[PDB]
Design an enzyme around this catalytic site. Structure first.
Site, PDB file in Angstrom:
ATOM      1  N   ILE B  17       0.809  -1.200   0.000  1.00 29.56           N
ATOM      2  CA  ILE B  17       0.000   0.000   0.000  1.00 29.56           C
ATOM      3  C   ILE B  17       0.849   1.258   0.000  1.00 29.56           C
ATOM      4  O   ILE B  17       0.391   2.289  -0.509  1.00 29.56           O
ATOM      5  CB  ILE B  17      -0.962  -0.007   1.216  1.00 29.56           C
ATOM      6  N   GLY B  18       2.066   1.203   0.565  1.00 30.00           N
ATOM      7  CA  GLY B  18       2.911   2.359   0.772  1.00 30.00           C
ATOM      8  C   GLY B  18       4.187   2.019   1.499  1.00 30.00           C
ATOM      9  O   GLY B  18       4.196   1.223   2.443  1.00 30.00           O
ATOM     10  N   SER B  19       5.287   2.628   1.084  1.00 31.06           N
ATOM     11  CA  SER B  19       6.616   2.233   1.549  1.00 31.06           C
ATOM     12  C   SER B  19       7.161   3.325   2.474  1.00 31.06           C
ATOM     13  O   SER B  19       6.409   3.793   3.349  1.00 31.06           O
ATOM     14  CB  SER B  19       7.495   1.870   0.349  1.00 31.06           C
ATOM     15  N   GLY B  20       8.407   3.770   2.309  1.00 34.31           N
ATOM     16  CA  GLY B  20       9.079   4.620   3.266  1.00 34.31           C
ATOM     17  C   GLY B  20      10.306   3.927   3.821  1.00 34.31           C
ATOM     18  O   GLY B  20      10.370   2.691   3.835  1.00 34.31           O
ATOM     19  N   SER B  21      11.284   4.690   4.305  1.00 34.31           N
ATOM     20  CA  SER B  21      12.491   4.042   4.801  1.00 34.31           C
ATOM     21  C   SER B  21      12.340   3.498   6.209  1.00 34.31           C
ATOM     22  O   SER B  21      13.209   2.738   6.647  1.00 34.31           O
ATOM     23  CB  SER B  21      13.683   4.994   4.748  1.00 34.31           C
ATOM     24  N   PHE B  22      11.275   3.864   6.922  1.00 31.72           N
ATOM     25  CA  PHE B  22      11.011   3.292   8.234  1.00 31.72           C
ATOM     26  C   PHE B  22      10.150   2.032   8.171  1.00 31.72           C
ATOM     27  O   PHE B  22      10.371   1.103   8.957  1.00 31.72           O
ATOM     28  CB  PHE B  22      10.337   4.324   9.144  1.00 31.72           C
ATOM     29  N   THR B  24       6.863  -0.354   5.647  1.00 32.00           N
ATOM     30  CA  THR B  24       5.965  -0.509   4.511  1.00 32.00           C
ATOM     31  C   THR B  24       4.641  -1.057   5.022  1.00 32.00           C
ATOM     32  O   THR B  24       4.597  -1.831   5.986  1.00 32.00           O
ATOM     33  CB  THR B  24       6.557  -1.426   3.419  1.00 32.00           C
ATOM     34  N   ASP B 130       1.756  14.224  13.978  1.00 29.28           N
ATOM     35  CA  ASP B 130       1.707  14.223  12.526  1.00 29.28           C
ATOM     36  C   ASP B 130       0.270  14.123  12.014  1.00 29.28           C
ATOM     37  O   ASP B 130       0.006  13.399  11.049  1.00 29.28           O
ATOM     38  CB  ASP B 130       2.546  13.066  11.974  1.00 29.28           C
TER      39      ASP B 130
HETATM   40  N1  LIG Z   1      -6.611   0.840   4.262  1.00 30.42           N
HETATM   41  C1  LIG Z   1      -5.850   1.082   5.471  1.00 30.42           C
HETATM   42  N2  LIG Z   1      -6.350   0.709   6.650  1.00 30.42           N
HETATM   43  C2  LIG Z   1      -5.664   0.931   7.748  1.00 30.42           C
HETATM   44  C3  LIG Z   1      -4.438   1.521   7.686  1.00 30.42           C
HETATM   45  C4  LIG Z   1      -3.966   1.857   6.445  1.00 30.42           C
HETATM   46  C5  LIG Z   1      -2.621   2.507   6.237  1.00 30.42           C
HETATM   47  S1  LIG Z   1      -2.393   3.389   4.736  1.00 30.42           S
HETATM   48  C6  LIG Z   1      -0.999   4.244   5.417  1.00 30.42           C
HETATM   49  C7  LIG Z   1      -0.048   5.163   4.610  1.00 30.42           C
HETATM   50  C8  LIG Z   1      -0.767   5.624   3.353  1.00 30.42           C
HETATM   51  O1  LIG Z   1       0.168   6.341   2.611  1.00 30.42           O
HETATM   52  C9  LIG Z   1       1.156   5.452   2.081  1.00 30.42           C
HETATM   53  C10 LIG Z   1       1.227   4.140   2.894  1.00 30.42           C
HETATM   54  N3  LIG Z   1       1.162   4.473   4.280  1.00 30.42           N
HETATM   55  N4  LIG Z   1      -0.806   3.845   6.684  1.00 30.42           N
HETATM   56  C11 LIG Z   1      -1.666   2.894   7.177  1.00 30.42           C
HETATM   57  C12 LIG Z   1      -1.333   2.280   8.522  1.00 30.42           C
HETATM   58  C13 LIG Z   1      -1.184   0.998   8.751  1.00 30.42           C
HETATM   59  C14 LIG Z   1      -0.800   0.545  10.148  1.00 30.42           C
HETATM   60  C15 LIG Z   1      -0.621   1.441  11.104  1.00 30.42           C
HETATM   61  C16 LIG Z   1      -0.792   2.904  10.797  1.00 30.42           C
HETATM   62  N5  LIG Z   1      -0.609   3.923  11.778  1.00 30.42           N
HETATM   63  S2  LIG Z   1       0.114   3.542  13.250  1.00 30.42           S
HETATM   64  O2  LIG Z   1       0.783   4.666  13.914  1.00 30.42           O
HETATM   65  O3  LIG Z   1       1.145   2.555  13.084  1.00 30.42           O
HETATM   66  C17 LIG Z   1      -1.159   2.838  14.312  1.00 30.42           C
HETATM   67  C18 LIG Z   1      -0.971   1.414  14.779  1.00 30.42           C
HETATM   68  C19 LIG Z   1      -1.885   0.845  15.518  1.00 30.42           C
HETATM   69  F1  LIG Z   1      -1.675  -0.445  15.924  1.00 30.42           F
HETATM   70  C20 LIG Z   1      -3.134   1.632  15.922  1.00 30.42           C
HETATM   71  C21 LIG Z   1      -3.306   2.868  15.490  1.00 30.42           C
HETATM   72  C22 LIG Z   1      -2.236   3.521  14.620  1.00 30.42           C
HETATM   73  F2  LIG Z   1      -2.359   4.806  14.156  1.00 30.42           F
HETATM   74  C23 LIG Z   1      -1.107   3.274   9.615  1.00 30.42           C
HETATM   75  F3  LIG Z   1      -1.247   4.586   9.326  1.00 30.42           F
HETATM   76  N6  LIG Z   1      -4.655   1.657   5.318  1.00 30.42           N
END
Ligand SMILES: Nc1nccc(-c2sc([C@@H]3COCCN3)nc2-c2cccc(NS(=O)(=O)c3cc(F)ccc3F)c2F)n1
Ligand SMILES: Nc1nccc(-c2sc([C@@H]3COCCN3)nc2-c2cccc(NS(=O)(=O)c3cc(F)ccc3F)c2F)n1
Lengths: 272, 258
Positions: B17-22, B24, B130
């Protein structure tokens, strides 16, 4: 790309210590080596660039009191290869060891690390994290300054992750968070200050503010400008010239500390 | 803590769905759909594990309909955090790439749900660090899921360096400001400083207080009560900014008028 070590040449040995970045292991490569690994699974192109830049910094150092860069890898994991130091950190000797040093040895250690730091600044490199834990006593007589602090700039390791994880967030940044983005308190003079603290440990045998067990008041009192190390803790036989030099490197106002060429003349002269 | 680990093999990783250096993020299967956020770490050290077990600890503290649901974590095959899968797009996608034009009614609901989740996090002493519309997932196009939180040498630090150890600009009030920016894009449907388009310029001018979101752009049917709320969250002076308990109570009182 001239210093890249081909992979399968190094036999990684026992882990010696870790960090939020990765791990340092002892190794075998045409003899003994230390190996600093970045356990990034799949480094990004930007992480790779920032690694090249740090290697760029290291490969311009060639001096006996600077830990010797020997090479770098990028194939499996990002890695930096340096000479291997026998012995312990200066911190371990001063603070966690039975055997203590004669004054003549302490001044010689102070002299060696001024040479290294003078060399670094001559070459426009700021260490940023000079402390007795980062001064390795190779064979227990040669100072090797290592463990360069993390540069804040957007072309180095940390700044690339700071600038990458907040690149797309600025539109939402409170002004007070923006202002803190680009900061950098590090200078040559800040390096000189750390050196004064390294002198404080050599000449007292202790760490400063051993009487303030609170990370928070140290920060407030030293930051605020009212707290500096206790110089009456210097040993009996510390030369008053060494004490005077100390107080100068520790001045609170940054542009009042001496440069390292002057610092170095002074110690070599007083070693007499 | 050991009771939230998901053993090797149970999760089936799908589309990236999305990557990054920290890390994916993947879509996965585990008792249904999940999101799997993989950390870019191979064989974590002691200190990285304690950093990880510490941050899972925060995520373990959240149980709220508008906070992305933590579901578990793994250590092999790799460090991962597992959450519910959100259906649909982020709020950023809707406002700025769909032009869905959520008629005002929902624009406010989304701002109510977002304030609900933020008030919950703050009441738990969690700063997001953020918040933005990219990090607000509009699950099934109805439920706000806030996700994507951010995050021994003092003796040797000169006064000027030791001062920086004493800053940290991230606070409850900087979260409020970022919420004020999300409000701006709900009520204008536009990002701030559209005209300018120069990160350095924006960094310099916002940081010093010469540049502020052009509130002239909030749409006409925008309730000025929350146009004034927007303006309160965006105060350049961080202490002039309202808390979420008051932000929420306010934004929920104007929603009665419907
Ligand atoms: N469809 C869909 N559904 C759900 C999530 C996502 C995406 S899409 C995206 C972005 C989109 O842009 C490019 C790819 N990256 N991130 C998540 C995602 C995935 C995992 C964790 C988090 N945030 S967290 O801090 O780790 C966290 C962890 C936790 F346990 C409880 C609450 C939290 F806030 C996420 F933001 N997608
Ligand atoms: N015995 C022995 N020998 C040598 C080193 C070490 C240890 S022990 C330790 C500490 C020990 O506690 C846990 C780990 N941290 N670090 C190294 C080491 C290893 C590699 C690099 C650096 N610093 S550097 O910036 O990358 C650098 C790289 C370069 F190419 C030239 C000059 C440099 F300054 C290091 F500090 N040990």
């Amino acid at each position: 790309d001239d210093w890249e070590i081909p992979d399968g040449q190094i036999t990684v040995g026992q882990r010696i210590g870790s960090g939020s970045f990765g791990t340092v292991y002892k190794g075998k490569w045409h003899g003994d080596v230390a190996v600093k690994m970045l356990n990034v699974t799949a480094p990004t192109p930007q992480q790779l660039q920032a690694f090249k830049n740090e290697v760029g910094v290291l490969r311009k150092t060639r001096h006996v009191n600077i830990l010797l860069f020997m090479g770098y890898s990028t194939k499996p994991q990002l890695a930096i290869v340096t000479q291997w130091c026998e012995g312990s950190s200066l911190y371990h000797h001063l603070h966690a060891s039975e055997t203590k040093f004669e004054m003549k040895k302490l001044i010689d250690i102070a002299r060696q690390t001024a040479r290294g730091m003078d060399y670094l600044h001559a070459k426009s490199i700021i260490h940023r994290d000079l402390k007795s834990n980062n001064i390795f006593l190779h064979e227990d007589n040669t100072v090797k300054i290592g463990d360069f602090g993390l540069a804040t700039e957007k072309s180095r390791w940390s700044g690339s992750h700071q600038f990458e994880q907040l690149s797309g967030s600025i539109l939402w940044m409170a002004p007070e968070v923006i202002r803190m983005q680009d900061s950098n308190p590090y200078s040559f003079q800040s390096d000189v200050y750390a050196f004064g603290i390294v002198l404080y440990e050599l000449m007292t045998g202790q760490l400063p503010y051993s009487n303030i067990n609170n990370r928070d008041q140290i920060i407030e009192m030293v930051g605020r400008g009212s707290l500096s190390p206790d110089l009456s803790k210097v040993r009996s036989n510390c030369p008053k010239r060494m004490k005077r030099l100390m107080a100068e490197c520790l001045k609170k106002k940054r542009d009042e500390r001496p440069s390292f060429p002057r610092i170095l003349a002074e110690i070599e002269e007083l070693a007499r």
